């Protein structure tokens, strides 16, 4: 599924990301835009054999188990396939654990490169929430 910008903003707000651990909603919408372009089925095989899955490109080396990555740790205690659903429940649950580490949203390279330091609020502006 490819979410519309406002559609994802409303969904993420419903999934409790409006002000989760100090991060405003715009951060999450912006992150999704640059990590997967709002596509829940997005996948990106990495060099180390790991793969980034879903709308928030969660990595198989540290967060989910896809059964094909070397030093997998499965910090989110969940199969990567669950992060490829049109239902963002699992991706949000795992993203919350990720951001709960001291590194916060810096875990998302695209967010760091294209969102951090920008007017992220713009990503939820002009939306019925």
């Amino acid at each position: 599924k490819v979410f519309g910008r406002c559609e994802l903003a409303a969904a993420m707000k419903r999934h409790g990301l409006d002000n989760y651990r100090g991060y405003s909603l715009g951060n999450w919408v912006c992150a999704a835009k640059f990590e997967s372009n709002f596509n829940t089925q997005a996948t990106n095989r990495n060099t180390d054999g790991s793969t980034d899955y879903g709308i928030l490109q969660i990595n198989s080396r540290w967060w989910c188990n896809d059964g094909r990555t070397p030093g997998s740790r499965n910090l989110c205690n969940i199969p990567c396939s669950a992060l490829l659903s049109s239902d963002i429940t699992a991706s949000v649950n795992c993203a919350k654990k990720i951001v709960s580490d001291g590194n916060g949203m810096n875990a998302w390279v695209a967010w760091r490169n294209r969102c951090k330091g920008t007017d992220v609020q713009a990503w939820i502006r002009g939306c019925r929430l």
Partner: antibody
Amino acid sequence: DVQLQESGPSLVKPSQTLSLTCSVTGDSITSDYWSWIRKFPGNRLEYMGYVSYSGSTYYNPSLKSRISITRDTSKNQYYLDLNSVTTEDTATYYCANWDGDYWGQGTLVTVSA
Amino acid sequence: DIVLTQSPATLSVTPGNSVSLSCRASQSIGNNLHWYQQKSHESPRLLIKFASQSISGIPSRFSGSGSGTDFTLSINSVETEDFGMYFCQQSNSWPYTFGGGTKLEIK
């Protein structure tokens, strides 16, 4: 599967450092976030803090920075240190993973002169 | 800190009857509220995560609902094994905080 268990002294003196250990069995401590929670008399629960995969820690300001949570991979366990304890620190201490799915059995620690 | 208030403090019910437990937050916490059950001489047990998400291994009679500042834990047809303490805990902001608990007893 995973098992957690607290261990350490059940009786400590005022002003000393209270230390507890949580031994994890079934998987590596490097594969989750680890927490400490305590229950005071009167069913009052307080989240003490947790240490995440990167080593970063989050401590409840209520502890006024008297707390330290560390890990030891070789022994697959993590610890809780609480300095300058007072009778207000008497409680049942529990270790549990960040998700809340796995808990130790809890251990009562009484601070008394 | 985010303050969680639970009510009623105590609730007596006859097995077979249903009940609802309330947990209200001093400020919005989205869906970041987990429910725990705790029996004497025992550690807490997670019943519901993120306001309404089910937990594998928990009886289906337990359900949660709510968002923002108002949440409830419902038990459809209470059983004797359900008597004990119930606590809500928010994870929206650090420090995580717990409600004062609701005691469920046999009437």
